[PDB]
Design a protein around this ligand. Structure first.
Ligand SMILES: [Zn+2]
Ligand SMILES: [Zn+2]
Length: 89
């Protein structure tokens, strides 16, 4: 009950998909018939997913930073905005 909910809460904190969470719950309730290989495979898959998303976000971050730094951000007419020009290109 409560401990089970806490377990789930902890998994969600790590971004595990509902599918992986369901699998972790099955291993959790019937440990005598599951192995470290199974649990680690679940962690590893999620780990690869996070590292991949991180790479994507940092890439967007680098572009956004350049767009941001190049624009004066003032009353300057958007007819001359570099951000619009960049997004067009
Ligand atoms: Zn400007
Ligand atoms: Zn601008």
């Amino acid at each position: 009950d409560l401990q089970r909910l806490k377990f789930i809460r902890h998994a969600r904190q790590l971004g595990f998909s509902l599918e992986s969470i369901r699998e972790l719950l099955s291993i959790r309730i019937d440990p005598e018939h599951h192995t470290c290989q199974e649990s680690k495979g679940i962690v590893q898959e999620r780990l690869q997913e996070v590292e991949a998303r991180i790479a994507e976000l940092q890439s967007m971050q680098r572009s956004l930073q350049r767009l941001n730094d190049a624009c004066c951000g003032t009353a300057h007419s958007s007819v001359y905005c570099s951000i619009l020009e960049a997004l067009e290109q």
